[PDB]
Each structure stands twice: as structure tokens, then as C-alpha cells.
Amino acid sequence: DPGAFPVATNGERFPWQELRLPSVVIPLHYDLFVHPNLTSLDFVASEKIEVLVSNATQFIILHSKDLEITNATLQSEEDSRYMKPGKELKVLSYPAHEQIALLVPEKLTPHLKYYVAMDFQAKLGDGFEGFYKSTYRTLGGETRILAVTDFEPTQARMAFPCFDEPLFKANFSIKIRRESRHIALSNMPKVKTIELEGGLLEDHFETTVKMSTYLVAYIVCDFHSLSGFTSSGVKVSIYASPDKRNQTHYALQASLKLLDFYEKYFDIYYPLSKLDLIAIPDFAPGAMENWGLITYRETSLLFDPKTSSASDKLWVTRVIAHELAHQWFGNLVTMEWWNDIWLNEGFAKYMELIAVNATYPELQFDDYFLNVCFEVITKDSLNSSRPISKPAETPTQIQEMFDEVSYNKGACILNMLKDFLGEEKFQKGIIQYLKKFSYRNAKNDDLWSSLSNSCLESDFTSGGVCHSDPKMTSNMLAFLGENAEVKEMMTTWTLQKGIPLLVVKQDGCSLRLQQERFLQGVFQEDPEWRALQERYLWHIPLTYSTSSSNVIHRHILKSKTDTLDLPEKTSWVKFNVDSNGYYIVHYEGHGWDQLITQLNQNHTLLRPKDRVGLIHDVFQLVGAGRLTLDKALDMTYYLQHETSSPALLEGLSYLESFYHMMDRRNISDISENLKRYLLQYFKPVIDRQSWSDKGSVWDRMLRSALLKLACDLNHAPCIQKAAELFSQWMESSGKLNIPTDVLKIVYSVGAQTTAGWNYLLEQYELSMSSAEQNKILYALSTSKHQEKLLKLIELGMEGKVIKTQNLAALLHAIARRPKGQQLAWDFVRENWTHLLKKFDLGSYDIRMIISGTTAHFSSKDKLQEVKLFFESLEAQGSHLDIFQTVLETITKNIKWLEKNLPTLRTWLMVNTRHH
Numbered sequence: 021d022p023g024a025f026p027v028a029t030n031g032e033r034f035p036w037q038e039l040r041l042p043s044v045v046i047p048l049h050y051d052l053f054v055h056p057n058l059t060s061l062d063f064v065a066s067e068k069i070e071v072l073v074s075n076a077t078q079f080i081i082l083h084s085k086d087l088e089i090t091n092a093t094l095q096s097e098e099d100s101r102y103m104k105p106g107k108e109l110k111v112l113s114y115p116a117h118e119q120i121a122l123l124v125p126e127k128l129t130p131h132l133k134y135y136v137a138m139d140f141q142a143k144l145g146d147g148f149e150g151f152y153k154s155t156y157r158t159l160g161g162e163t164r165i166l167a168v169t170d171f172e173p174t175q176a177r178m179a180f181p182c183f184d185e186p187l188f189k190a191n192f193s194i195k196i197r198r199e200s201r202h203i204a205l206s207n208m209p210k211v212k213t214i215e216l217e218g219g220l221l222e223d224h225f226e227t228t229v230k231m232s233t234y235l236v237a238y239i240v241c242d243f244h245s246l247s248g249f250t251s252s253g254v255k256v257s258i259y260a261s262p263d264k265r266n267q268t269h270y271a272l273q274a275s276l277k278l279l280d281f282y283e284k285y286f287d288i289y290y291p292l293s294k295l296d297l298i299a300i301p302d303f304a305p306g307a308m309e310n311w312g313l314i315t316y317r318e319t320s321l322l323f324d325p326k327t328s329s330a331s332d333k334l335w336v337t338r339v340i341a342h343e344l345a346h347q348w349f350g351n352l353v354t355m356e357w358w359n360d361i362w363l364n365e366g367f368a369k370y371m372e373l374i375a376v377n378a379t380y381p382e383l384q385f386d387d388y389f390l391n392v393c394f395e396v397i398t399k400d401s402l403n404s405s406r407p408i409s410k411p412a413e414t415p416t417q418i419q420e421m422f423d424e425v426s427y428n429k430g431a432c433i434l435n436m437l438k439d440f441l442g443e444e445k446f447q448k449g450i451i452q453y454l455k456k457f458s459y460r461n462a463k464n465d466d467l468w469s470s471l472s473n474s475c476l477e478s479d480f481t482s483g484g485v486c487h488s489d490p491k492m493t494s495n496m497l498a499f500l501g502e503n504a505e506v507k508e509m510m511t512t513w514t515l516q517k518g519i520p521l522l523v524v525k526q527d528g529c530s531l532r533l534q535q536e537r538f539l540q541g542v543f544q545e546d547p548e549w550r551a552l553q554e555r556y557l558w559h560i561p562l563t564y565s566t567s568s569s570n571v572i573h574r575h576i577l578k579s580k581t582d583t584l585d586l587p588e589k590t591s592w593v594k595f596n597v598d599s600n601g602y603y604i605v606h607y608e609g610h611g612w613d614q615l616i617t618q619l620n621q622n623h624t625l626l627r628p629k630d631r632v633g634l635i636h637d638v639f640q641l642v643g644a645g646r647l648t649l650d651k652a653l654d655m656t657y658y659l660q661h662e663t664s665s666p667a668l669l670e671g672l673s674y675l676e677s678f679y680h681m682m683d684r685r686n687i688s689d690i691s692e693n694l695k696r697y698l699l700q701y702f703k704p705v706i707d708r709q710s711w712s713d714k715g716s717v718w719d720r721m722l723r724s725a726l727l728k729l730a731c732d733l734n735h736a737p738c739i740q741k742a743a744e745l746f747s748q749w750m751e752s753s754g755k756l757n758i759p760t761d762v763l764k765i766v767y768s769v770g771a772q773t774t775a776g777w778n779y780l781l782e783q784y785e786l787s788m789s790s791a792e793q794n795k796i797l798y799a800l801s802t803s804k805h806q807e808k809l810l811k812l813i814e815l816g817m818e819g820k821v822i823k824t825q826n827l828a829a830l831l832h833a834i835a836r837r838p839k840g841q842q843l844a845w846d847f848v849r850e851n852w853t854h855l856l857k858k859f860d861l862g863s864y865d866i867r868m869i870i871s872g873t874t875a876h877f878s879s880k881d882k883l884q885e886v887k888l889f890f891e892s893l894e895a896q897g898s899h900l901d902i903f904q905t906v907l908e909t910i911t912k913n914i915k916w917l918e919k920n921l922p923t924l925r926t927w928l929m930v931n932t933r934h935h
């Protein structure tokens with residue numbers, strides 16, 4: 021070659037300059053041996069990778085980061101020039117691409133398997149990536165060290181050199197070495213353990229199935245487990261720090277139930293013999309779906325019924341399903357590349373609806389799934405949005421791809437799709453895909469084909485439409501042309517950024533339809549809006565009922581404008597029944613008036629997921645410049661009779677969000693008025709709430725929400741109960757049991773005095789439930805004294821009292837509250853060098869810190885400081901897609917304030933004037 025590029029550590033040229041690995045050498049079986057100490061806090065290790073060469077080469081490229089490689093031999097069974105003992109390979113490290121090059125003495129012969137073998141060693145990492153160190157406090161006050169592995173997406177290479185791209189699937193055989201005082205876990209169960217010369221044990225795990233690197237796990241710790249067996253015979257075990265074993269019972273119960281449901285629903289036995297869920301304390305990700313060894317942070321798995329909320333339970337249930345789901349969606353079938361990551365997470369997130377709704381209908385989680393979409397829409401409604409699958413190449417660009425577009429928008433379009441096809445056709449399509457790609461990879465296209473080409477019961481009858489020798493019928497031509505329709509449809513939902521807005525004018529019996537990209541911060545008549553609607557066009561599966569019928573009219577819209585005729589001229593039409601469709605409806609003409617009519621009158625004539633959607637749509641149109649605020653505010657008057665905790669709780673959110681908004685600026689005039697409307701118009705529901713744990717899950721949530729509202733507006737009777745419960749709690753030395761649904765309210769009332777604040781900080785360190793610890797930390801952030809809040813973030817940087825994994829979470833709390841809002845923003849700026857040392861630029865921690873302290877700003881002055889800060893960041897190495905999204909969010913807040921604030925002031929003064 022031209023010797024042109026590039027120079028390796030040691031100064032010789034590297035024979036490779038692509039960021040992606042070459043594909044000429046393919047791995048079959050990794051033979052891994054890991055020997056960590058945990059008093060050295062380091063490890064030595066060896067690996068034998070059995071590899072197939074296809075195009076002949078004189079060098080191998082594979083990933084290795086921050087690993088001291090010190091042997092590297094090459095043996096072959098078939099190319100007998102490298103017969104055992106084998107030959108040695110020259111090793112080159114190109115750290116800039118996290119790659120290494122092994123240099124052969126003779127070109128490798130195509131179509132022959134070789135065995136690549138290196139020895140290596142590294143200190144145990146100390147930063148929640150790779151093979152890293154992590155600790156936990158016992159009930160006695162003992163701190164214990166565990167050594168655990170988190171690899172997704174590109175961190176496997178930090179713990180053993182390997183082909184660290186998810187398409188390179190392989191079998192792994194993991195051997196661990198450990199003192200007798202520790203146990204060793206990995207992906208597969210444990211075949212043999214041999215006692216060795218110095219009383220050290222060596223654990224020998226069953227050989228993994230074909231699997232991607234980033235899923236390998238191995239833990240060395242001393243936890244205790246709780247076990248049960250599924251209908252299928254899987255040995256589920258909930259693993260946890262030994263004094264918390266009695267907090268694992270729910271987890272086991274639910275995962276037994278869940279793991280069963282999945283198996284039946286997918287029609288694919290979970291392959292492995294065991295499955296282990298382990299609750300780790302120093303766990304930066306919420307939970308890692310490592311095949312057979314799913315690691316959760318304690319708050320995402322454990323459950324203390326004395327201190328865990330009802331919503332805490334639902335959260336644990338959701339996460340356990342989410343991880344379980346990945347066993348199929350992610351692990352059996354895996355994305356070709358990270359560009360199609362939502363095939364992994366966006367399915368897992370849709371499934372937790374399906375699965376929870378099937379196993380804990382008690383938890384009413386179907387009534388909560390619409391938040392998952394409403395959340396993302398606020399971000400798909402910005403030019404800053406990305407398509408579901410977008411190219412990504414850097415480690416950072418990958419990390420970046422786990423935002424809410426992959427999780428949430430992926431989840432919602434699936435639920436949209438499913439409601440297009442009905443769940444029995446939609447499940448048969450999910451099976452035909454997990455089966456077809458078992459132990460392989462799929463890309464975006466692969467899925468849409470396999471869902472598009474559904475089969476209702478593979479009827480395989482005398483002439484089943486699917487399978488064997490079918491019959492050539494009128495339906496079959498509908499089938500195949502209706503199938504191509506749904507693949508050609510969902511292809512636009514995954515390749516176009518953003519979210520459509522359907523305009524609906526009613527013209528007597530004729531209904532006219534327009535489609536356009538819904539956008540915020542920008543009106544229609546703005547000079548920048550004609551330029552963002554240009555080529556966006558979806559295939560939007562519409563639905564609608566009307567005032568005169570509940571039948572579900574279904575029509576596909578594949579064009580920029582369309583009109584539908586209608587019979588029995590109705591009072592009003594409701595589009596997008598139940599808000600299952602990933603789109604917003606704006607009724608032109610008297611449309612928005614006529615629906616508000618129905619809600620203000622009988623109101624049951626609209627079905628509750630309509631009201632939830634209508635409540636939602638009405639307000640975003642206000643933020644689209646389409647509706648004067650007073651229309652959305654007038655919908656909330658109906659909430660007085662809203663029987664449905666969901667729609668009540670939503671309409672309530674907006675009315676509360678305004679308050680926090682107004683409070684962050686000294687807009688006390690609207691601030692007080694918003695309080696007075698909240699406590700006086702919703703007084704009948706606030707006052708009948710109980711200070712207890714009783715009621716259904718939605719009943720409980722509506723208690724905590726309202727009791728928090730009341731104490732955040734300082735309603736003396738509701739502050740007084742919390743003061744008194746708090747004092748009783750503190751005078752019992754923690755022994756009195758506060759109801760869980762009141763547990764956070766009581767602490768942050770108690771945090772409001774420095775005696776209370778101090779006792780809570782002391783109690784944080786002594787608590788045996790992460791669940792409680794978390795509520796106490798919210799209480800501490802509730803403080804109005806800056807020196808206290810600053811101590812909190814000071815303790816967060818030390819990682820001892822408050823672990824750093826909650827420091828992003830902590831900052832965000834502090835910055836939400838007005839007293840600490842500048843303090844957060846100022847802190848992040850003054851220590852941005854120090855935050856980068858603790859956290860990867862692509863981490864969820866850093867992204868949350870950024871938007872956590874800035875995205876609530878609603879002033880042109882703070883926008884400048886934010887633009888200025890992000891500029892400085894771009895000038896250095898740092899570049900994140902979040903920077904734009906934050907600025908477009910602040911800009912949307914400035915514009916929404918400019919157009920709407922005086923409407924909110926007159927609306928509220930008008931209400932006072934009527935009553």
C-alpha cells in the first residue's frame with residue numbers, strides 16, 4: 021500500500037483505517053478465562069477465539085480498548101503451518117479506533133478455521149463501563165466490593181479483545197476464578213467448579229448459544245438468591261446483597277409470571293436453562309438485558325412493601341418485563357447494526373404494555389401507556405427530531421441512539437400498527453419474525469416484511485392462504501396487495517423524522533382532510549414553516565367515530581389532501597379513536613367548539629382514551645399557534661366531573677406545568693391565580709383523598725398527585741397533616757410507618773426545616789431500601805436554602821454519601837425547583853471539566869445533566885447563555901445532538917410565553933370574576 025496512514029502506538033503503520041471492522045475474518049467461538057482479584061482490583065485473563073477466514077489476509081483486525089495484550093499466538097487445525105504450538109503474532113494498538121491489529125507471518129488460507137489466542141490484563145475499571153468495580157453497604161455498615169460487567173453497546177472490548185460489532189455473533193465459553201468467599205455468575209449455568217492448588221476455585225460455565233459480544237456478562241460477588249421454576253422449567257433466581265434478600269420476593273413472582281407469558285405469547289421457549297436477575301447498587305443503566313444474567317439497579321427490581329410506592333411496584337414490573345422481552349427482542353434476534361437499535365428497545369418497550377396488561381391487569385398499565393407517546397411527541401414535534409433509524413458510527417453517535425425516539429416512537433408506531441392489524445394477526449407476525457431470525461440479525465426492512473406478511477392462523481386448511489399448496493382467490497389478491505400496503509406504509513414511519521398533523525374541516529356531510537408536519541415554536545404563517553413541510557408525507561391509518569355512532573370507520577390516507585363522504589350528518593366527528601394513532605387531529609371550523617360542548621355536557625359520549633387524547637391535542641395545538649390558549653383552558657372546566665383518573669390527571673398536568681413555569685420567573689400574579697384556581701376548582705376531589713395506602717393503582721396515584729399538588733401550593737390543612745406525620749416519624753426514630761403514597765410528601769415537608777432536613781440526610785445513609793433512599797433525596801432537593809442544595813450536589817461529586825449514579829438524577833431535581841435552578845445551571849458550567857471525567861459524553865447521565873438544567877429556561881437571556889455554553893462545548897471535542905434539542909425547546913418556551921401568557925392572565929382573572 022502507499023504507507024499513507026495511520027500510525028499505531030509503537031510507531032508502525034496500522035493496516036486498517038475503517039471504524040467498522042473488516043468482515044473477512046469471522047468469529048465462531050470465544051474461549052474466555054477471567055481471573056479478577058478484588059483486593060488488587062484488577063484482573064488477568066486469556067482468550068482463544070476460533071475464527072473462520074474467507075478472503076485471504078495477512079492481518080486480523082478486532083477491537084480492544086484499555087487492555088494490556090501480552091501474548092498473541094495463532095494455532096490452526098486445518099492450516100498446518102500453524103499447527104500447535106502455533107506461531108506468534110506481532111500486535112499493534114490503534115487506540116483512536118479502539119482497534120488492534122494482529123500480524124501474521126504468512127497469508128491466511130481462505131476457508132480454514134484458525135484459533136487466535138491472546139493473554140491480557142487490566143485494572144478493574146471504576147466507572148460503570150466494561151468489567152468494573154462496584155460496592156454496596158451491608159446492614160452492619162460493611163462496605164463490600166463486587167466486580168460486574170456492563171457492555172452495551174461497544175464496551176465489551178474494554179474487558180476482552182474481541183470482534184465487538186453485534187453482527188459478529190458467536191458462542192462463548194466463560195471460565196472464572198475466585199476466592200472461596202465469592203460466587204461467580206455468567207450468562208450460562210455452571211457446569212463444574214474445580215478446587216485449585218491454593219484453595220482458589222475456578223468456575224466453568226456451560227457454553228453460550230450464538231450471541232453478540234455486548235451481552236456477555238460475568239459477576240463476582242457474594243449475593244444471596246431466591247429461586248423458583250417456570251412452567252417451562254427455567255430456574256429464575258433473584259440475586260441481591262444478602263441483607264436485602266427479603267426484598268426480592270415480588271421480582272421473583274412477577275418474573276416467573278412474566279417469563280411464562282412471553283414464552284407462550286412468542287411460541288418460542290426461552291432457550292437457556294436458568295435465568296438470573298441481579299440487583300446491583302452502582303448501576304448507571306437502569307437494567308442490562310444480558311442473556312441469563314440481567315442486571316438491574318436495586319430501585320428497578322427490589323420492592324420493600326413498607327417503603328415502596330404502588331407506582332414503585334408498577335415500575336419494577338415494567339422494567340422486569342422490559343428486560344424479559346429482550347431475551348427474544350434483542351438476544352434471540354439482534355439488530356444488524358446500531359442504526360436499527362429500535363428493533364431491540366422499541367419492541368421491548370411495546371412489549372411491556374402487552375405483557376404487564378396480560379399478567380397484572382390489576383396494575384391498569386394500559387391506561388398509562390399513552391404517556392409513553394405523549395412524551396416523545398413533544399420532541400418529535402421539533403425539527404431537532406431524528407428518524408427512528410438513523411446512521412450512527414462513533415461510539416457516541418451510538419449511545420446517542422438510545423433516546424426516546426428509539427424507545428418511545430418505536431413503541432407507539434408498533435401499537436399503532438397492531439391496532440391496524442388486530443392483535444392475533446400482529447402476534448402471528450411477531451412469531452414468524454423471532455423464529456425466522458433466531459440466532460441471527462435483522463435490519464429494519466427485515467421486520468416490516470415479516471409483520472406485513474402476517475398470517476391469521478397459518479390456516480393450512482384445504483387451501484390455507486399460508487403454507488402448503490394454497491388456493492388462488494379474490495381474498496389472496498387482497499391479502500398480498502393489502503400486505504405490501506402495510507410494509508410500504510410503516511417504511512415512511514421509520515424513515516421520516518417528525519409527526520403528522522391531520523387538519524379536518526367539516527363541510528356538511530363532506531369531510532376534508534389535510535396532512536402536514538406538526539411543529540412547535542413555529543406557526544404556519546412563519547417564513548420558516550413552508551420550508552419544513554416540503555417532502556414530509558405519511559401513510560396515516562386514520563380512524564374515527566362520530567356523534568351519531570360508535571362504529572369504527574377506518575381509512576388509509578396516502579396523500580396531502582383527501583375528502584371522505586359521511587351519512588347521517590352528525591353533531592361532531594372524533595378522529596383517531598382512543599388516541600392509538602401516532603398523530604394529532606385539529607378540527608377546523610366549529611370542530612373544537614363542538615367537542616368541548618360534549619365534554620362540558622354529558623361527556624361520557626366520548627370514550628376515556630378519547631378525552632385523554634383530546635385533552636392532549638387541544639393544548640399542543642395551542643403550542644402550534646393553531647388554538648388560542650383559552651380553548652384548551654376551557655376544556656379543563658369539564659375535569660370537575662372527569663371521573664377517569666387518567667384524563668383528570670393529564671388535564672391537571674398542564675394546569676400544574678403552567679404554575680411551575682410561572683413560578684420560575686417572579687410572575688407571582690399569574691402564579692397565585694393559578695394556585696387559587698387549582699385549589700378551588702378541584703377542591704372536592706382533593707379533599708376526599710385519604711392519607712393511606714388504600715385503593716386501586718389509579719386511585720392511589722390520584723391520591724399522591726393531589727396531595728402533592730396541595731402541599732406544593734401550601735394548602736395549610738394538607739401541609740399540617742404532613743408536618744404531623746413527619747414529627748411522629750422523627751420522634752419514633754424512624755419506626756412509625758407512613759403510608760407509602762404519602763411518603764415523599766411527608767419527607768419534603770419535613771425537609772423544609774433544617775432539623776427535618778438533617779434527619780433525612782442522616783436517614784438516607786442508614787436505609788435498607790433504595791426506594792426509600794430515593795424519596796428522601798427528592799425531599800432533600802426540596803430545600804429552599806442554597807447551601808443545602810449545594811451540599812447535595814457536593815455530596816454527589818464525592819460519590820460516597822450520595823452515589824454518582826444518582827447525581828444526574830439529583831441535579832435534575834434541584835434545577836426543577838426555582839430556588840435551585842440557577843445553582844444547578846451555574847454548577848454544570850463551572851465543573852463541566854469534572855463532569856466529563858466522571859461520565860461519558862454520550863452517557864444518559866450527561867444528556868440528562870444538560871437538559872436537566874437548561875430545557876426549562878423560558879427567557880431570551882438564558883437562551884443566550886445556553887447557546888454560548890454549547891458553543892464552547894462544540895469548540896472542544898464535545899458534540900451532542902441534545903444541544904440543538906435544548907435550544908429548540910427553550911425557543912419553543914419563549915415563543916409559547918410570548919403568544920400565550922396574556923391569554924393565561926385574562927383567562928384566570930376571568931374565572932375569578934365569575935366565581
Ligand SMILES: *[C@@H]1O[C@H](CO)[C@@H](O[C@@H]2O[C@H](CO)[C@@H](O[C@@H]3O[C@H](CO)[C@@H](O)[C@H](O[C@H]4O[C@H](CO)[C@@H](O)[C@H](O)[C@@H]4O)[C@@H]3O)[C@H](O)[C@H]2NC(C)=O)[C@H](O)[C@H]1NC(C)=O
Nearest residue numbers: 055056057058059060061197198199200202218219220221
Ligand atoms: C487475591 O489476592 C490476594 C492477596 O493479594 C490473595 O490472597 C493471598 O493468597 C495467598 C496464597 O495465594 C496467601 O498466602 C498463603 O497463606 C496460606 C495460609 O493457609 C499459607 O499456607 C501459604 O504458605 C505457602 O505459600 C506461600 C506463597 O503462597 C509460600 O511463600 C510459603 O512458603 C508456603 O509455600 C501462604 O502464606 C495469602 O495469605 C492471601 N492473602 C490474603 C490477604 O488473603 C488471593 O488468593 C487472591 N484471590 C484471587 C481470586 O486471585
Ligand SMILES: O=C(C[C@H](Cc1ccc(O)cc1)n1nncc1CNS(=O)(=O)c1ccc(-c2ccccc2)s1)NO
Nearest residue numbers: 305306307308309320339342365419422423427863864
Ligand atoms: O432499556 C434499557 C436501558 C434503559 C436505560 C438507558 C440508558 C442509557 C440511555 O442513553 C438510554 C436509556 N432502561 N433502564 N431501565 C429501563 C429502561 C428503558 N425504559 S426507559 O423509559 O426508556 C428509561 C431510560 C432510563 C431510565 C431510568 C432507570 C432507573 C432510574 C431512573 C431512570 S428508564 N436496557 O434494556
Ligand SMILES: *[C@@H]1O[C@H](CO)[C@@H](O[C@@H]2O[C@H](CO)[C@@H](O)[C@H](O)[C@H]2NC(C)=O)[C@H](O)[C@H]1NC(C)=O
Nearest residue numbers: 048049190191192193227228229230231458459
Ligand atoms: C453455539 O450455539 C448454537 C446455538 O445458536 C448451538 O447450536 C445448536 O447445537 C445443537 C447441538 O449440536 C443442535 O442440536 C441445535 O439444533 C443447534 N441449534 C441452533 C439454533 O443452531 C451450537 O452447538 C453452539 N456451538 C458450540 C461450539 O458450542
Ligand SMILES: *[C@@H]1O[C@H](CO)[C@@H](O[C@@H]2O[C@H](CO)[C@@H](O)[C@H](O)[C@H]2NC(C)=O)[C@H](O)[C@H]1NC(C)=O
Nearest residue numbers: 373374375376377378379381386389435442443
Ligand atoms: C389488555 O388485556 C385485556 C384483557 O385483560 C385485553 O382485552 C381483551 O381484548 C380482546 C380483543 O380485543 C377482547 O376480545 C376481550 O374481550 C378483551 N377482554 C376484556 C376487555 O376484558 C386488551 O386487548 C389488552 N390490551 C392491549 C393493549 O393489549
Ligand SMILES: *[C@@H]1O[C@H](CO)[C@@H](O)[C@H](O)[C@H]1NC(C)=O
Nearest residue numbers: 043044073074075076130131
Ligand atoms: C472477497 O472480497 C471481494 C471484494 O470485491 C468480493 O467480491 C468477494 O466475493 C470476496 N470473497 C471471495 C473472493 O471469496
Ligand SMILES: *[C@@H]1O[C@H](CO)[C@@H](O)[C@H](O)[C@H]1NC(C)=O
Nearest residue numbers: 066090091092093108138139
Ligand atoms: C506467553 O505465555 C506462556 C505461558 O502461557 C509463557 O511461557 C510465555 O513466556 C509468554 N510470553 C512470551 C513472550 O513467550
Ligand SMILES: *[C@@H]1O[C@H](CO)[C@@H](O)[C@H](O)[C@H]1NC(C)=O
Nearest residue numbers: 265266267323324325326327
Ligand atoms: C423483611 O422485610 C420487612 C418488611 O419490608 C422488614 O420489616 C424486615 O425488617 C425484613 N427482615 C428483617 C430480618 O429485617
Ligand SMILES: *[C@@H]1O[C@H](CO)[C@@H](O)[C@H](O)[C@H]1NC(C)=O
Nearest residue numbers: 402403404405548549551552
Ligand atoms: C431543520 O433541519 C434540517 C436538517 O438538514 C436543516 O437543513 C434545516 O435548516 C433545519 N431548519 C431549521 C429552521 O432549523
Ligand SMILES: *[C@@H]1O[C@H](CO)[C@@H](O)[C@H](O)[C@H]1NC(C)=O
Nearest residue numbers: 620621622623624625626661
Ligand atoms: C348521558 O346519556 C346517557 C345515555 O342515555 C344517560 O344514561 C346518562 O344519564 C346521560 N348523562 C347526563 C349527565 O345527561
Ligand SMILES: *[C@@H]1O[C@H](CO)[C@@H](O)[C@H](O)[C@H]1NC(C)=O
Nearest residue numbers: 683684685686687688838839
Ligand atoms: C422574586 O422576588 C423576591 C422578593 O423577596 C426576591 O427575593 C427573589 O430573588 C425574586 N426572584 C427572582 C427569580 O427574581
Ligand SMILES: [Br-]
Nearest residue numbers: 283284287288
Ligand atoms: Br411454548
Ligand SMILES: [Br-]
Nearest residue numbers: 172173305422
Ligand atoms: Br444502556
Ligand SMILES: [Br-]
Nearest residue numbers: 304305306864
Ligand atoms: Br438510568
Ligand SMILES: [Br-]
Nearest residue numbers: 317318319790
Ligand atoms: Br439502585
Ligand SMILES: [Br-]
Nearest residue numbers: 331334335338
Ligand atoms: Br411507572
Ligand SMILES: [Br-]
Nearest residue numbers: 707737738741
Ligand atoms: Br387534607
